[PDB]
Design a protein around this motif. Sequence first.
Motif, PDB file in Angstrom:
ATOM      1  N   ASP A 101       0.846  -1.194   0.000  1.00  0.00           N
ATOM      2  CA  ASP A 101       0.000   0.000   0.000  1.00  0.00           C
ATOM      3  C   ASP A 101       0.878   1.239   0.000  1.00  0.00           C
ATOM      4  O   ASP A 101       1.591   1.499   0.967  1.00  0.00           O
ATOM      5  N   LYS A 102       0.866   1.973  -1.110  1.00  0.00           N
ATOM      6  CA  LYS A 102       1.645   3.205  -1.206  1.00  0.00           C
ATOM      7  C   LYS A 102       1.084   4.138  -2.259  1.00  0.00           C
ATOM      8  O   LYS A 102       0.096   3.822  -2.920  1.00  0.00           O
ATOM      9  N   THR A 103       1.710   5.297  -2.398  1.00  0.00           N
ATOM     10  CA  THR A 103       1.334   6.237  -3.438  1.00  0.00           C
ATOM     11  C   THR A 103       2.171   5.978  -4.686  1.00  0.00           C
ATOM     12  O   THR A 103       3.388   5.800  -4.598  1.00  0.00           O
ATOM     13  N   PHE A 104       1.508   5.929  -5.851  1.00  0.00           N
ATOM     14  CA  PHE A 104       2.169   5.657  -7.133  1.00  0.00           C
ATOM     15  C   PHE A 104       1.348   6.346  -8.220  1.00  0.00           C
ATOM     16  O   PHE A 104       0.305   6.903  -7.928  1.00  0.00           O
ATOM     17  N   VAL A 105       1.839   6.268  -9.463  1.00  0.00           N
ATOM     18  CA  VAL A 105       1.168   6.941 -10.570  1.00  0.00           C
ATOM     19  C   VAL A 105       0.661   5.893 -11.558  1.00  0.00           C
ATOM     20  O   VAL A 105       1.234   4.785 -11.676  1.00  0.00           O
ATOM     21  N   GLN A 106      -0.418   6.272 -12.241  1.00  0.00           N
ATOM     22  CA  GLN A 106      -0.982   5.488 -13.332  1.00  0.00           C
ATOM     23  C   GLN A 106      -0.908   6.290 -14.616  1.00  0.00           C
ATOM     24  O   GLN A 106      -1.220   7.482 -14.629  1.00  0.00           O
ATOM     25  N   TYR A 107      -0.492   5.626 -15.688  1.00  0.00           N
ATOM     26  CA  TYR A 107      -0.507   6.218 -17.037  1.00  0.00           C
ATOM     27  C   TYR A 107      -1.556   5.505 -17.873  1.00  0.00           C
ATOM     28  O   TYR A 107      -1.597   4.283 -17.879  1.00  0.00           O
ATOM     29  N   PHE A 108      -2.380   6.265 -18.573  1.00  0.00           N
ATOM     30  CA  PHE A 108      -3.366   5.692 -19.498  1.00  0.00           C
ATOM     31  C   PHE A 108      -3.267   6.281 -20.889  1.00  0.00           C
ATOM     32  O   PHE A 108      -3.121   7.500 -21.030  1.00  0.00           O
ATOM     33  N   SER A 109      -3.385   5.432 -21.911  1.00  0.00           N
ATOM     34  CA  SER A 109      -3.800   5.903 -23.239  1.00  0.00           C
ATOM     35  C   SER A 109      -5.170   5.328 -23.518  1.00  0.00           C
ATOM     36  O   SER A 109      -5.317   4.106 -23.510  1.00  0.00           O
ATOM     37  N   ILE A 110      -6.164   6.200 -23.751  1.00  0.00           N
ATOM     38  CA  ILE A 110      -7.536   5.733 -23.998  1.00  0.00           C
ATOM     39  C   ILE A 110      -7.861   5.855 -25.476  1.00  0.00           C
ATOM     40  O   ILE A 110      -7.910   6.964 -26.016  1.00  0.00           O
ATOM     41  N   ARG A 111      -8.080   4.728 -26.148  1.00  0.00           N
ATOM     42  CA  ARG A 111      -8.450   4.792 -27.546  1.00  0.00           C
ATOM     43  C   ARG A 111      -9.807   5.454 -27.706  1.00  0.00           C
ATOM     44  O   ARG A 111     -10.804   5.031 -27.113  1.00  0.00           O
ATOM     45  N   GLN A 112      -9.830   6.501 -28.529  1.00  0.00           N
ATOM     46  CA  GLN A 112     -11.083   7.274 -28.722  1.00  0.00           C
ATOM     47  C   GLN A 112     -12.152   6.551 -29.541  1.00  0.00           C
ATOM     48  O   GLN A 112     -13.330   6.787 -29.329  1.00  0.00           O
ATOM     49  N   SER A 113     -11.705   5.628 -30.388  1.00  0.00           N
ATOM     50  CA  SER A 113     -12.581   4.791 -31.190  1.00  0.00           C
ATOM     51  C   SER A 113     -12.377   3.338 -30.731  1.00  0.00           C
ATOM     52  O   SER A 113     -11.542   2.647 -31.285  1.00  0.00           O
ATOM     53  N   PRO A 114     -13.122   2.866 -29.707  1.00  0.00           N
ATOM     54  CA  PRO A 114     -12.937   1.491 -29.207  1.00  0.00           C
ATOM     55  C   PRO A 114     -13.055   0.445 -30.324  1.00  0.00           C
ATOM     56  O   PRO A 114     -13.804   0.627 -31.289  1.00  0.00           O
ATOM     57  N   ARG A 115     -12.333  -0.659 -30.144  1.00  0.00           N
ATOM     58  CA  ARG A 115     -12.294  -1.743 -31.130  1.00  0.00           C
ATOM     59  C   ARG A 115     -11.942  -3.054 -30.469  1.00  0.00           C
ATOM     60  O   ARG A 115     -11.394  -3.106 -29.364  1.00  0.00           O
TER      61      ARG A 115
END
Length: 272
Positions: free
Chosen positions: A194-208
């Motif tokens: 249990d700690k503090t960390f970062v999340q990175y996302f790339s979200i595809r705008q046109s799901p497939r």
Amino acid sequence: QVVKPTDERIIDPSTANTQLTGGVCYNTTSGGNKPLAGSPYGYETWIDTGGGVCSLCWYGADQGGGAAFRATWTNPHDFLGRLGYFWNENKPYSHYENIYCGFNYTRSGRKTAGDYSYIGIYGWSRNPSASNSNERLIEYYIVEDWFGNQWQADTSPMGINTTGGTVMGSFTVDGSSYQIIRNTRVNQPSIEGDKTFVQYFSIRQSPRKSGTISITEHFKKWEKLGMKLGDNMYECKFLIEAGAGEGFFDARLIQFYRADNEGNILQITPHH
């Protein structure tokens, strides 16, 4: 620039849609990565015993690109099933050169995976020398698709109301714009407790549900926005995550491959 691989061992995802059989299934939490026999890949399951039946079934080394799996969930609490590269050998992403994943799957419909859900590429990385202690551990997602929920169609890309965090930018690759998001998880569970960390996302705008993911392109764009991955990549796997609901995921193709900038294959799976 970077030459797209044309090696004939690469399976065209668009038409790789034959149902697979002969799965080997895992119905409980794996407790981390577990190597697969005769494969470069490993799987992981997180199946909270507070919820209903879940499973991940691997289709084996010799069909479906080698990393194909099915998964099922029945009222889970945040089921995660994933399969692909396991690394954790003190190397930055660039060590692995240009990473690609060809995929084709079917899944249950809208609102069969709870209020949040994710399909695509997933892993972690470590960056102990980062000046900001929040950024020394990273969880990452390249989100090709999801199940939507009561409020939002599965044809509509998720946004920061689902992921949390801040839109950093965007770019276009593999036929769609992707929104890039950084989120901080404050005192939350992780691969390091249990700690503090970062999340990175790339979200595809046109799901497939089929295509090729140029994974390294995301890593490069994140790093240009100051979303650094560090010097110890943990894994790079294909994921289905379901917050709740009753549903399934069934891949006809999951094929990872790596190529250098000339487009020559460094790693790929699997007479007339």
